[PDB]
Design a protein around this motif. Structure first.
Motif, PDB file in Angstrom:
ATOM      1  N   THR A 116       0.819  -1.208   0.000  1.00 31.72           N
ATOM      2  CA  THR A 116       0.000   0.000   0.000  1.00 31.72           C
ATOM      3  C   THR A 116       0.857   1.264   0.000  1.00 31.72           C
ATOM      4  O   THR A 116       0.551   2.226  -0.713  1.00 31.72           O
ATOM      5  N   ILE A 117       1.928   1.278   0.786  1.00 33.48           N
ATOM      6  CA  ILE A 117       2.716   2.475   1.049  1.00 33.48           C
ATOM      7  C   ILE A 117       3.987   2.425   0.206  1.00 33.48           C
ATOM      8  O   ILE A 117       4.820   1.536   0.399  1.00 33.48           O
ATOM      9  N   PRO A 118       4.187   3.353  -0.737  1.00 33.59           N
ATOM     10  CA  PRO A 118       5.489   3.450  -1.411  1.00 33.59           C
ATOM     11  C   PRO A 118       6.566   4.014  -0.498  1.00 33.59           C
ATOM     12  O   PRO A 118       6.895   5.201  -0.579  1.00 33.59           O
TER      13      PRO A 118
ATOM     14  N   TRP B 276      -2.965   7.659   7.342  1.00 37.31           N
ATOM     15  CA  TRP B 276      -3.656   7.461   6.073  1.00 37.31           C
ATOM     16  C   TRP B 276      -4.930   6.655   6.295  1.00 37.31           C
ATOM     17  O   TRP B 276      -4.879   5.462   6.613  1.00 37.31           O
TER      18      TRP B 276
ATOM     19  N   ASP C 194      -7.182   6.094   3.945  1.00 35.78           N
ATOM     20  CA  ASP C 194      -7.713   5.860   2.607  1.00 35.78           C
ATOM     21  C   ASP C 194      -8.566   7.050   2.182  1.00 35.78           C
ATOM     22  O   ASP C 194      -8.028   8.139   1.964  1.00 35.78           O
TER      23      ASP C 194
ATOM     24  N   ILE D 243      -7.641  11.416   5.011  1.00 35.98           N
ATOM     25  CA  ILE D 243      -6.394  11.291   5.755  1.00 35.98           C
ATOM     26  C   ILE D 243      -6.653  11.672   7.205  1.00 35.98           C
ATOM     27  O   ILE D 243      -7.507  12.513   7.500  1.00 35.98           O
TER      28      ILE D 243
ATOM     29  N   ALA E 181       2.078   7.452   9.042  1.00 36.83           N
ATOM     30  CA  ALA E 181       2.669   8.043   7.846  1.00 36.83           C
ATOM     31  C   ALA E 181       4.190   7.976   7.885  1.00 36.83           C
ATOM     32  O   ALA E 181       4.824   7.435   6.972  1.00 36.83           O
TER      33      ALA E 181
ATOM     34  N   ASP F 266       5.433   8.367   3.405  1.00 41.66           N
ATOM     35  CA  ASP F 266       4.627   7.837   2.313  1.00 41.66           C
ATOM     36  C   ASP F 266       4.193   8.998   1.429  1.00 41.66           C
ATOM     37  O   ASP F 266       3.562   9.945   1.910  1.00 41.66           O
ATOM     38  N   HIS F 267       4.533   8.928   0.140  1.00 42.05           N
ATOM     39  CA  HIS F 267       4.228  10.045  -0.747  1.00 42.05           C
ATOM     40  C   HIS F 267       2.730  10.221  -0.941  1.00 42.05           C
ATOM     41  O   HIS F 267       2.285  11.302  -1.345  1.00 42.05           O
ATOM     42  N   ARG F 268       1.939   9.187  -0.658  1.00 41.13           N
ATOM     43  CA  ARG F 268       0.489   9.313  -0.735  1.00 41.13           C
ATOM     44  C   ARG F 268      -0.029  10.168   0.415  1.00 41.13           C
ATOM     45  O   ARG F 268      -1.192  10.587   0.413  1.00 41.13           O
ATOM     46  N   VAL F 269       0.827  10.428   1.403  1.00 41.16           N
ATOM     47  CA  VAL F 269       0.450  11.277   2.529  1.00 41.16           C
ATOM     48  C   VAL F 269       1.404  12.459   2.648  1.00 41.16           C
ATOM     49  O   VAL F 269       1.049  13.602   2.336  1.00 41.16           O
TER      50      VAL F 269
ATOM     51  N   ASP G 212       4.782  14.725   1.703  1.00 40.98           N
ATOM     52  CA  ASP G 212       5.543  15.109   0.520  1.00 40.98           C
ATOM     53  C   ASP G 212       6.955  15.482   0.945  1.00 40.98           C
ATOM     54  O   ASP G 212       7.175  15.882   2.093  1.00 40.98           O
TER      55      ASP G 212
END
Lengths: 233, 233, 233, 215
Positions: free
Chosen positions: D10-12, D66, D68, D71, D153, D187-190, D192
């Motif tokens: 899920t987390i990059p 996160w 989904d 946030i 995160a 995590d870039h989805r959260v 930056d």
């Protein structure tokens, strides 16, 4: 039969009345104090000068200068000298400086009449006056009553600082100690020579006077103590 | 016709109410004070450092540090911060630091909300905040009311020490002076260089706080003043 | 659900009664304080001497000397030690010196019985006595009650000065700090070496004691502190 | 393993690492401990944790969860710690450390270590933490990659401070200061890059002068 002796002393209406008034003074007045010191060295030399001319008649004391600066200090900031009338306040433009005299009988409050007008040839013989007729008990109580404020110096014996009594409806009164040489670092390096800072303690009632203002009374007051010539024009 | 002028001044509900509350405060609370001094020199350099980074947005003052140490000082010893409830006592775990602001209108008591959590980027703009909305009179009295304790610095004008007012049900409050260089003998011989010790005066009610404890509040407090880094982890 | 926790603590008859008595003490007694300092250095060396002989049995403390000078100070000027009886005053020729002991339980007032007669082999084991039975709570309250005056030293932690509590009908009581080396300019030039002046703070009620007199109690008192040998004959 | 797996998928996971000189902070350890030896002993990691909290207080974007569809941005800061024990990885959670002083967080970490070594701490006090922190550098690892756990995160991993050469205006003296390796994950989805990188910027700025935490 054993020990435990003590003395039941009959009290004089002087003590008794002063106690009844000072009591309700306390309960009514949240007494707080403010104390500072100022160098009289130049002022003491002004005492040796003014007295090197004035020895011909009378002698001068330092306290008179502190009283003078106290008057003018009120002239520039009348908020310092005021009386508490309850429902309203009594703000006195006429300045009458009471003085606390040390005598075997007890506390005496000789009142000075408009000292701020008087010169170097007046206030001296006036203080020495009230001391004269005061030592003999000739001064009437009314001339010990009604004074806007008072001043007391117990430092003659060396007390650093202390707490005094005011009397209603007198907002503020000053109590002075003995000047003791304290270290002031100088740009002159080796010489550290200490100058005597005369302890000056003032009292105020927060229901009348406020801290910053009276504190200002001591600020421009002490500023006068630096250069008493500030009183001339 | 003669003199004797004075001024009957109508009093504002601010003064009047503050007087009615502070009076019964006095009669109820046997006010006593405790005063000490601590060297802020390293803390002042911390002011030039934290401000050499933080000039980009806001400016910092020294009093904020004293307030911070006051909070944490209560966190380590909650007995310092408490309220007198009469039949029982109010011991406050939540620390809200009131501040005494000097304004022409009168005394103002802006209350800080949980300053102990706030960092170097918060408490500054918060004090400057309450000063902002306080100078305009926008702050509501309730945000001047309910504070656990308060803090006041009148030393900006150079008062050595002094007595302040607390307000019920606030057990203790601190009053600060101006730091004045005093002589500390050093092992370095010739150099005597004096460090400025900021006058710190605290008040307590013996019906609530006791001397040794609050005195400890100033002990570990000043210990924080030596190394403010003690607040970090 | 949020915060705001505090503690409602049941109070012990010790605290409660002490508070009820000290309250009316305040309202009745216009408490004021007088504080000074005296060099114990020669007296400390007298502690190393008297203890270099007396280590064989017991150890001595400096406070006992201050107490001794307090007694004799009253012997020479009984006006210092007195009790307020209202309608009349209680002037005590018998001198019983109470002491303020610091214990986790609270304030304790062990009373010394005629210490002025006792020598160097008595008062020490007497103070250590009242501390012994006091730490265990064995001393009865009556031996904590009825004392003419008391004495308290909180300076062990370094408090410069402070305000203490008296108890009626006790006119005056002394509170001592910690001796801290202060600069006394000397005729010896280069050597400025500072001597430790032990902070000595005394309280008085103006309805009983007057400033000049008690101040004298500290004057001849400190004079005894200069040369404790003044107590011998 | 089942949770960390889906965490990965899920987390990059990506990492950010830097170093800061604790020398003045170490001397602050000898000072704060020269007073505080009377009761408890202090460790350096606690300071890094403290700066981590306040770093989130000034930039809440660092601490987030996160959820989904949305946030979870946590204002309440609870710092988990990675403890090394023979049994395995342990995640003692600190409760609002940012409020705690020098007399609290120490006995709190030593606490969770106490009840953690005996296995007395319940899993729920190892669960729900906003983020965590781990120092494996005690054995001298320069840098490395760690594990986070959802929905956390970011988490930090620290190494061992090793003296590195900083050229000085003092010429002959080159004396090297120990820079403690500090590695953070995001995590870039959260989170930056620039922001968290800022978390380390003002973080390390706190490490320079920890007094920045006082007021």
């Amino acid at each position: 039969v054993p020990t435990g002796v003590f003395t039941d002393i009959p009290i004089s209406n002087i003590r008794r009345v002063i106690a009844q008034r000072l009591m309700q003074s306390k309960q009514t007045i949240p007494h707080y104090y403010l104390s500072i010191d100022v160098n009289m060295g130049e002022v003491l030399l002004v005492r040796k000068e003014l007295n090197k001319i004035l020895e011909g008649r009378s002698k001068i004391s330092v306290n008179d200068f502190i009283i003078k600066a106290s008057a003018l200090a009120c002239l520039k900031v009348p908020e310092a000298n005021s009386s508490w009338m309850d429902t309203v306040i009594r703000q006195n433009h006429v300045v009458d400086v009471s003085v606390a005299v040390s005598t075997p009988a007890g506390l005496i409050t000789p009142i000075v009449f408009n000292a701020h007008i008087k010169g170097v040839e007046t206030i001296a013989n006036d203080v020495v006056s009230l001391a004269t007729k005061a030592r003999e008990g000739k001064l009437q109580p009314h001339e010990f009553q009604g004074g806007t404020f008072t001043i007391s110096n117990l430092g003659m014996f060396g007390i650093k600082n202390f707490s005094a009594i005011i009397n209603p409806p007198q907002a503020c009164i000053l109590a002075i100690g003995a000047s003791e040489d304290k270290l002031v670092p100088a740009d002159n390096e080796k010489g550290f020579d200490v100058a005597s800072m005369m302890s000056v303690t003032l009292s105020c009632d927060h229901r009348v006077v406020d801290g910053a203002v009276g504190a200002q009374w001591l600020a421009e007051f002490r500023k006068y103590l630096e250069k008493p010539i500030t009183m001339l024009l």
